[PDB]
Design a protein around this ligand. Structure first.
Ligand SMILES: Nc1ncnc2c1ncn2[C@@H]1O[C@H](COP(=O)(O)OP(=O)(O)OP(O)(O)=S)[C@@H](O)[C@H]1O
Ligand SMILES: Nc1ncnc2c1ncn2[C@@H]1O[C@H](COP(=O)(O)OP(=O)(O)OP(O)(O)=S)[C@@H](O)[C@H]1O
Lengths: 402, 306, 396
């Protein structure tokens, strides 16, 4: 798990230098208009993702990037005999050099020889350990375009955005609502299977304990825990613990420590249900601190084969996630990107204030960091509300014009 | 609404690069904009108002001075922010002769207090009021009323300060607004007296509570330099009382000649909006700065800003 | 010309109602997420432009829009024989009713209904004032330039539903083209005035036939100016005249001073709109300077940025925020055409410093045209809380 410690861009567009030092938890980058914020985020995303062929579309003289581990990537663009040459050098002495003509030819064609050489270089030197979840400023328009894309496929959207916004634009990998729904379904399935495995194992162990044994307030505690794990979501596939407690009490009224194992069996199970569903529960609680008149919930029923994940309204009407507005979709996506149920990323968000009221803006970063994922977040923003309470993490970029 | 919050405003201060001035209300914003524009018509200063900053605390929801003090405490040191809070009755001693403990503009780390009770008290030089009432007042006999004012203002400011101080003592800010009316005042050889009518919306207990303190104060307020009296009056009540006194002067002048015209003029100006009077006075005060010597202004604040 | 005074939307989307009253100069609309802000701007844009054919794509019960002049357009969607009808009734007593099926079919194809709508619009003086519409998606559509209005509107309707207004905000490319056209017009007016001044100066000299420090200053000022860079032979003339006068009446010098002052005044008046717009834009941009150059011997004026080293760049190199600033300022400039300006979230990609001077600098350009804004940022409404509206739907 690396993180950017310094980006020193020189002669970007042949008009301004820009050196920036980063933190490891949160970096709110602000600055006057035309200061290089978007260019800085684009450089970061392109270096992190390993896409070194896009630097042939940017005019510069140096891009030095220092990682937390200690790897230093130096990218030059030197003109030799009127031919441009992008050379990438690492800290261990390995370099790759390719001509801008071949890079543009490969971009126009689309795995050319240049692409294969770059890919082998990146793979050998381990320059793709951490991905980069890039949230473009034009989120709403792109989301309307698609579905009228995923964190992995993300190929048609990237091509469209590159045609519209030049060929240095980092690939769009931010997770869409559809991928979030699929991921939540998969996580719920995994949690269900884990809970079933735990039930099997604990049944075996408790039977062993009871067989080994064969050679007052307990009832109240059993009832108190039985009510908890009976009328709660995540156990709708079976909600008859009240009957079990009633029958146990009836039989007792009609050895002494036998009921003790019951409290253990229920206790451990309840604890497991709060660790298997931990990530989804945290993410949904974070999301529901924003939505009003709708809550995001998962329903388990015996009739329906697939556990349903979607919005719940007070009247009891479920609905797919697509019904949410633009602001809700953005909230959901960024909160997922910062949630524990990702893979690995350096979440880059450009203008997180698009289509958000001040109320949600003030609580956005606080709730994103509330999930202790540890993923480095870089936010290029103009809204003072987004940065409230994090004035000590702010980075002001002021490029030094030549 | 869509106003900022205290933390959001501190973040805005650290983000922005302009020079800012934080005033308590929305009228001060206009007057100080006029002052700054006069001294440098191309000024990149922004005057923000605490009234448009939301505070979660219920106590702070209406106390703008506490809002300014809080923001100053949390952002002390920054060199692109200046604060301007009103002086209320702080540092004012009412032992016999009304005295000003601090005779200059209080300054404490970018926080500046007003010379008098508020920005509206800079307007209380005889020259400014006399000039600024002509531009808006009709003429039943204009120049006559102006001349009668020019003299009556000497005791008028003492009486107005007494009214404000009595209101402060009885802990009823708005009482002078409705209790006193233009027909109420009485003029006797350039001497202002405040007769007591019979009917009053507030309970007669309130009327007594005011008038007793007023009578007690009057000798106290008639033994200090008129400058202190002009400093110790309040803004809105002072403006309203001055409107009423000009109305009374209109009636006194016009009663001898014609009843209808005098009554029309007096009852007319008695309805003129407070915003109009305050804007005219601000225009006169800004247009009459430095040229005279008895006309004050927040010089220290202007020096600190820009 | 005209200006909306009220809007009474009923059963919009079968979910809520609304009733908003608008000021005459500036209206700032703020509210919580889900409020009918975008729908309100769309309804006002569609009603002003006369695009009543688009109301076949909205689910409503009765819309009532009233201008300042007195018209009280009222659009009613109803069901007769299980067929949806949109009836547009004016205050004059007229009425046109068209079927929703015909509108949907025509929009799919693109007709008699379109011709009837146009006839109603033109006959009753309904297209009097257009409405610039700055959508929430300005960078994507602006970048979708690789009529602009027609193609962009088709795209934006394929994306964001068919009720969207026609997108006719002045794009940066259109801004550059219009600036160049205004430059050419200024130059040609200067030429015409030059000919007329030559004639009248011959006349004035002849009439004479039957202070030098000021002329020095005027000639020096006029010689160094991008506006009058072509001739540029003014210092030489003044020096020669001074030498001749010294060697050797003053009425000729008076005539010359009058002529030079008149030419300078006309030059200031011709480039008035362009210079004012460029000054307004340059109150914002830092480290750059929008400027023009009518020189090179290549007869095509250059309009573009000027960095502080003599390096020129085109307008396409600007960032999103700077381009949006350009666009909005032009929409508020005297070079714009349509009165009503409907800007949806003018706070996109704009620094707080610029948000805090945007409305002052747009109202300072003395166009006098109505501006309606929908903002989520407190920085845009500062100093304009008397002109701020809050809309709250009465969810039914
Ligand atoms: N050929 C060029 N293409 C793009 N940018 C250029 C070029 N030449 C110079 N520049 C500079 O690059 C800047 C763009 O910086 P960006 O990072 O895209 O803007 P930004 O930091 O996102 O600010 P905002 O918020 O988008 S206005 C311009 O303001 C120019 O000063
Ligand atoms: N096709 C539709 N059918 C039903 N309701 C809709 C439809 N389109 C929009 N709405 C709702 O109409 C209301 C107003 O529209 P919106 O565009 O969402 O206003 P808005 O959400 O305040 O705009 P912002 O700035 O993006 S939050 C919202 O509650 C929407 O959910």
């Amino acid at each position: 798990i690396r993180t950017i410690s310094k980006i020193e861009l020189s002669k970007i567009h042949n008009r301004y230098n820009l050196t920036v030092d980063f933190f490891n938890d949160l970096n709110v980058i602000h600055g006057k208009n035309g200061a290089g914020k978007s260019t800085l985020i684009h450089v970061i995303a392109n270096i992190v993702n390993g896409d070194f062929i896009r630097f042939a579309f940017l005019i510069f003289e140096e891009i030095k990037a220092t990682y937390s581990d200690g790897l230093k990537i130096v990218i030059r663009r030197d003109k030799i005999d009127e031919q441009s040459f992008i050379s990438v050098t690492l800290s261990n002495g390995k370099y790759i050099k390719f001509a801008v003509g071949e890079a543009m030819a490969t971009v126009r064609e689309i795995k050319s020889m240049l692409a294969m050489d770059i890919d082998k270089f990146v793979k050998e030197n381990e320059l793709q350990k951490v991905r980069a979840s890039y949230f473009p400023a034009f989120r709403t328009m792109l989301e309307a375009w698609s579905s009228s894309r995923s964190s992995f496929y993300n190929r048609k959207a990237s091509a469209f955005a590159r045609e519209l916004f030049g060929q240095f634009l980092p690939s769009i990998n931010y997770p869409s609502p559809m991928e979030i729904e699929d991921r939540l379904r998969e996580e719920i399935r995994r949690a269900q299977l884990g809970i079933a495995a735990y039930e099997s194992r604990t049944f075996s162990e408790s039977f062993v304990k009871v067989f080994s044994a064969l050679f007052g307030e307990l009832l109240k505690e059993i009832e108190g825990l039985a009510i908890a794990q009976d009328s709660s979501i995540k156990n709708g596939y079976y909600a008859e613990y009240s009957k079990v407690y009633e029958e146990i009490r009836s039989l007792i009224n009609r050895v002494s420590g036998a009921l003790v194992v019951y409290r253990d069996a229920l206790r451990d199970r309840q604890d497991y249900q709060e660790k298997a569903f931990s990530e989804i529960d945290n993410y949904m609680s974070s999301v529901n601190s924003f939505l009003e008149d709708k809550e995001m919930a998962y329903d388990f029923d015996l009739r329906r084969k697939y556990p349903k994940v979607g919005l719940k309204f007070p009247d009891g009407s479920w609905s797919p996630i697509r019904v949410l507005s633009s602001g809700e979709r953005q909230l959901l996506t960024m909160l997922y990107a910062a949630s524990k149920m990702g893979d690995d990323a350096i979440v880059l968000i450009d203008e997180p204030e698009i289509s958000l009221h001040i109320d949600w803006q003030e609580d956005l970063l606080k709730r994103m960091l509330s999930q202790l994922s540890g993923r480095q977040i870089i936010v290029c923003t103009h809204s003072p509300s987004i940065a409230t309470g994090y004035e000590d993490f702010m980075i002001n970029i002021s490029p030094e014009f030549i | 609404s869509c106003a900022y919050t205290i933390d959001s405003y501190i973040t805005l201060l650290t983000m922005s690069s302009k020079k800012r001035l934080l005033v308590e209300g929305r009228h001060d914003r206009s007057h100080l904009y006029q002052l700054i524009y006069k001294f440098n018509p191309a000024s990149k200063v922004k005057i923000d108002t605490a009234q448009d900053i939301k505070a979660s605390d219920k106590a702070m929801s209406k106390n703008n001075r506490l809002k300014i003090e809080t923001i100053h405490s949390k952002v002390k040191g920054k060199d692109n922010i200046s604060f301007l809070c009103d002086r209320e009755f702080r540092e004012f001693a009412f032992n016999d002769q009304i005295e000003d403990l601090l005779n200059s503009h209080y300054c404490d780390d970018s926080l500046y207090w007003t010379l008098g009770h508020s920005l509206e008290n800079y307007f209380f030089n005889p020259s400014i009021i006399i000039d600024a009432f002509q531009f808006l007042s009709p003429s039943e006999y204009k120049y006559k009323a102006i001349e009668l004012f020019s003299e009556l203002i000497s005791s008028s400011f003492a009486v107005l300060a007494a009214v404000s101080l009595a209101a402060k003592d009885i802990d009823k800010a708005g009482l002078p607004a409705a209790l006193i009316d233009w027909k109420d005042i009485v003029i006797n050889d350039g001497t202002i007296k405040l007769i007591r009518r019979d009917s009053y919306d507030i309970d007669s207990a309130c009327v007594d509570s005011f008038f007793n303190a007023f009578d007690a104060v009057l000798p106290r307020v008639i033994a200090s330099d008129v400058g202190i009296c002009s400093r110790v009056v309040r803004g809105h009540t002072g403006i309203l009382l001055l409107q009423k006194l000009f109305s009374a002067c209109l009636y006194y002048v016009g009663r001898e000649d014609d009843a209808l015209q005098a009554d029309s003029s007096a009852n007319y100006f008695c309805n003129l909006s407070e915003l109009s009077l305050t804007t005219a006075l601000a225009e006169s005060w800004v247009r009459k700065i430095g040229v005279l010597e008895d006309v004050y202004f927040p010089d220290s604040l202007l020096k600190n800003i820009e």
